[PDB]
Symmetry: C2
Subunit: 352 residues, 2 copies
């Protein structure tokens, strides 16, 4: 593995996997490679690629300093993209799963395509990356609940706020990174994992949060892709302010037992969103995520000012206080008599 | 708190087989394994026959001293069950999954669509031990061969009518639950209680029985329970898998051949996946040395180390039959695939599996 790249203070990078739908039926497209081959010169900052499926358009920012910069690169990418979409009679929308799309790892891979948002935070060293990773792992339940946007799967209400994460549960590498206390221990772990033929690079390990020594960042990849660009930017600010608070204040001394209930709390967030309950593994104390998330928001507020994300922190606070659950909001649209086709159309208009 | 760990006679055996009750002439999972059970009330001389899941019949031996006593208790329950079946026009067969069946507690609330799949069927083996520390040592020893147990028992390539491409797909059914796979690491009984105390702080678990681990300790029965295997097509195989586990348990606790450390589990999920997907053709990788070898080869090394222990406890037959299987280059999953490749239907396949069990 290469030396851990020394990145600039808390740099930021965002990747969004958007859905490409084909009107008027509004199911996922399969001919969206021509979208990239339509913006292959119409994007100055950031990057746009596509999956092997052709139903996903990935937008990525370059390395930014704050959410205002990310927001600008996304805004500029959005105009071109929307133009190309219209030019090809296609539409773009966010969300963790397409509501009705129906589909060697055999059948595990034969499930509908899903859409996630990844956020990269710069670190100065490997030991800092490891500290940042463990610190962020504590709020993964919170990051999932705040971004949950995938209640529907193949036409049925799964009851989950975010069902997308269930699609990877059978894979060996799913979930939290195995524990390591520092960068040296991480290199040994990666060395051991590399023994299998399945693992050749870190890119192959789909942990919820993973470090990158080549880019000098820690990557959070547990979130559903948001319905709007602004919410995606706010989640990124949230993660950047938490990173700043963790690394500058070092509020915790990380212990393996901090991860004991990691999967149980992760499940509660996927299944119930902010109404899920988080349990402390050391004391057994339980708290709804709405309450606990408000406490995270108040704790990282000063750090949010410092790196320019206080506006994201304030908006997330307003949303937790009022409820605003996209999962439910989708269910209400449908409960009010709207159709899944209509819901996808609504989401296309919303993203624009 | 958890019960004190019951002092069992070491190496005794308790076996459970969840059998499939199918309905001719369509051969789908039946919804009457109840009237069949009520038909065998009392008839069972030793052991027990119970359901949960109207398509499932569970055959459980009592606590046995050796595999022969076990082969005995099953053979007798089998005759009884086979006759009750005949009188109700139902049939019985093994296998980890029903090849074409499609789906129709406080678990629904929590998991929703995740548990609304097809019924899966496993063989469970309980090995008695003297204490909690011994149970922990025994569990870690057995965790090293979980890939071997799965591969040797693989018999669930089909799921809901479709070929999954796995040898044993049943072990994935619980991949979405927070407590599936290997038990979190603890080094002795004292730490295990601390582990269980932690886990029970959550809503879905108040007892050892709510845990979906591959291998689970039972302070109540005074046993270490291996629960990763698919229910085999025959009773002889079920009995032979129990003898392997018993022989390995004997080798582990008497020779104490490994010095257990958390790093031993590092590649547990990758090796577990290789077994599920390719059966004995799977490759096993050591996390320490990085050595890679197919499960066929590794299973033969296991059979060698446990031959002496098997002789003393009366399970050499199990070991020899397993050895022939390993070098036979044939596996239930491929035999099911060949059947279908040759023109057979999944329905025909189930009918054939009922004739095999009988």
């Amino acid at each position: 593995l290469p030396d851990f790249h020394v990145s600039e203070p808390f740099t930021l990078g965002i990747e969004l996997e958007m859905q490409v739908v084909n009107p008027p039926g509004y199911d996922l497209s399969q001919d969206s490679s021509m979208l990239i081959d339509a913006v292959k010169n119409k994007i100055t900052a950031g990057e746009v690629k596509h999956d092997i499926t052709e139903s996903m358009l990935e937008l990525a920012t370059d390395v930014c300093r704050d959410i205002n910069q990310a927001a600008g690169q996304f805004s500029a990418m959005q105009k071109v993209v929307l133009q190309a979409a219209t030019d090809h009679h296609l539409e773009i929308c966010g969300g963790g799963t397409h509501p009705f799309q129906k589909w060697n790892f055999g059948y595990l891979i034969q499930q509908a395509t899903v859409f996630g948002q990844h956020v990269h935070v710069g670190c100065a060293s490997g030991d800092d990356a490891i500290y940042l990773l463990h610190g962020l792992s504590r709020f993964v339940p919170h990051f999932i609940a705040l971004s949950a946007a995938s209640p529907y799967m193949q036409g049925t209400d799964t009851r989950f706020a975010s069902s997308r994460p269930n699609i990877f549960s059978a894979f060996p590498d799913n979930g939290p990174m195995p524990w390591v206390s520092n960068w040296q221990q991480f290199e040994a772990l990666f060395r051991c994992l590399s023994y299998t033929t399945m693992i050749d690079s870190i890119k192959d390990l789909h942990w919820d949060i993973r470090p990158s020594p080549h880019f000098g960042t820690v990557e959070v990849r547990v979130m559903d892709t948001p319905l709007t660009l602004s919410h995606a930017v706010n989640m990124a600010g949230l993660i950047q302010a938490t990173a700043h608070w963790l690394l500058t204040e070092r509020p915790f001394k990380h212990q393996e037992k901090d991860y004991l209930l990691y999967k149980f709390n992760r499940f509660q967030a996927c299944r119930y969103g902010l109404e899920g309950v988080i349990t402390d593994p050391h004391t057994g104390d339980r708290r709804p995520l709405t309450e606990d998330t408000l406490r995270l928001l108040e704790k990282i507020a000063p750090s949010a000012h410092k790196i320019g994300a206080s506006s994201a922190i304030e908006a997330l606070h307003r949303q937790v206080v009022s409820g605003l659950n996209e999962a439910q909001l989708m269910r209400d649209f449908v409960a009010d008599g709207g159709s899944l086709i209509g819901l996808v159309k609504k989401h296309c208009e919303i993203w624009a």
